[PDB]
Amino acid sequence: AKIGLFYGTQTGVTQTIAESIQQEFGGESIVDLNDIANADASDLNAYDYLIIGCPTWGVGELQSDWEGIYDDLDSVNFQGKKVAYFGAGDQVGYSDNFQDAMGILEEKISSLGSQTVGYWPIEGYDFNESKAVRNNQFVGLAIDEDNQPDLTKNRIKTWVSQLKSEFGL
Numbered sequence: 251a252k253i254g255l256f257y258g259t260q261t262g263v264t265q266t267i268a269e270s271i272q273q274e275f276g277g278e279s280i281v282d283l284n285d286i287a288n289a290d291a292s293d294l295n296a297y298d299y300l301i302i303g304c305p306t307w308g309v310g311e312l313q314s315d316w317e318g319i320y321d322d323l324d325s326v327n328f329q330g331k332k333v334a335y336f337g338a339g340d341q342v343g344y345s346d347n348f349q350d351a352m353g354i355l356e357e358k359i360s361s362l363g364s365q366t367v368g369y370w371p372i373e374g375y376d377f378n379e380s381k382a383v384r385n386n387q388f389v390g391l392a393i394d395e396d397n398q399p400d401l402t403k404n405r406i407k408t409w410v411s412q413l414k415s416e417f418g419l
């Protein structure tokens with residue numbers, strides 16, 4: 251596929267979201283699903299369009315598989331690549347660290363020469379702080395199954411539609 255989606259998950263939510271995103275894009279012929287846990291950093295080189303999925307754990311911390319591969323990221327060719335992000339978080343229980351993981355990954359990967367695409371509005375959420383917010387918008391799709399599970403489907407639908415234009419589909 252032209253789009254490589256790499257996700258990490260602890261309790262499975264981010265994987266379900268990744269599968270739904272793949273489905274919304276048109277399936278396996280359009281998006282390849284890859285669990286970062288089973289990947290080498292070089293695996294990301296095979297795609298020119300990437301989607302990075304990661305839930306926030308601990309207190310504003312990276313999901314462990316992403317945490318473990320983080321230091322290998324700078325060896326990857328992200329030069330000029332369009333990268334989109336999504337994450338699972340809990341805005342009620344972690345209002346000061348909502349979606350921090352996605353923010354941490356985007357800060358790192360964008361500093362490696364990539365172009366972030368897929369910005370998302372913060373208005374549909376209620377939180378205090380997030381490392382995933384740059385000038386009043388999320389750097390990617392924020393999903394919250396803990397507090398807003400009923401909004402997930404339409405958010406993915408809307409975001410993928412937005413991404414298609416931003417990627418070139």
Ligand SMILES: Cc1cc2nc3c(=O)[nH]c(=O)nc-3n(C[C@H](O)[C@H](O)[C@H](O)COP(=O)(O)O)c2cc1C
Pocket residue numbers: 258259260261262263264265305306307308309310311313338339340341344347348349350395396
């Ligand atoms: C112990 C614990 C810590 C968490 N820490 C955060 C956090 O700092 N920020 C946040 O947005 N969500 C936080 N969450 C919420 C998770 O990101 C959320 O439950 C998500 O659905 C987990 O996704 P996963 O199943 O892909 O691992 C935490 C949840 C638990 C149970």
